[PDB]
Each structure stands twice: as C-alpha cells, then as structure tokens.
C-alpha cells in the first residue's frame, strides 16, 4: 500500500511484436569544450601527380 | 615543454665521458612525440628505481 519496487524486468520474447521486441540503442553525443580536438574523419586522398 | 596544451618532449641519447659531473660542448634535441591533453601543469616529480 502507497509503496512499489521500482525496478522491473522486460519481456522480450521470440512472440514480441514491432512495439516490444528488443532493440539494441546506442546514444552518441558530441562535446565541444575549450579542449582541443581528439577525433576527427577520414580525409579523402587521391594519386600523387 | 607545455604549448596551449599540447605538451611535447624532445629527448638526446649521446655517449659522454664523465670528468666534471656535467660534460660540456653542443648537440642538438630532436623531438620524440606530441601530446594533446590540454590540463594545466604547474609542478613535477621524478619517478626513481
């Protein structure tokens, strides 16, 4: 009464349709700080004339 | 050396013949690698075996 364990397991079965089955997410966030830089694309590159 | 955070380090290996604790004369330091870590540094300590 008035109390509940927060914390609940998910039910991902072979049978889960589109709105419950699993799906692995991944978050990428960017920061830009005052810092220098650390990781940047890869260039492009062409034959030496 | 400490420059705007990227921290660099130039290094000299030379053979020498003690006479006066300190071996006079001329060289040249060429550098041994580029750091960008960008924390402000004030002191420092040797690491002895």
């Given at each position: 009464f008035?109390?509940?364990?927060?914390?609940q397991?998910?039910?991902?079965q072979?049978?889960?349709g589109?709105?419950?089955?699993?799906?692995?997410?991944?978050?990428?966030?960017?920061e830009l700080?005052?810092?220098?830089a650390?990781?940047?694309?890869?260039?492009?590159?062409?034959?030496?004339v | 050396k400490?420059?705007?955070?990227?921290?660099k380090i130039?290094?000299?290996?030379?053979?020498?013949?003690?006479?006066?604790?300190?071996?006079?004369?001329?060289?040249?330091?060429?550098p041994?690698?580029?750091?960008?870590?960008?924390?402000?540094i004030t002191?420092f300590?040797?690491l002895?075996?």
């Amino acid at each position: 009464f008035n109390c509940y364990f927060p914390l609940q397991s998910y039910g991902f079965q072979p049978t889960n349709g589109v709105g419950y089955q699993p799906y692995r997410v991944v978050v990428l966030s960017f920061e830009l700080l005052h810092a220098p830089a650390t990781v940047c694309g890869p260039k492009k590159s062409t034959n030496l004339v | 050396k400490n420059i705007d955070g990227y921290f660099k380090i130039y290094s000299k290996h030379t053979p020498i013949n003690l006479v006066r604790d300190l071996p006079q004369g001329f060289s040249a330091l060429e550098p041994l690698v580029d750091l960008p870590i960008g924390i402000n540094i004030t002191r420092f300590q040797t690491l002895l075996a």
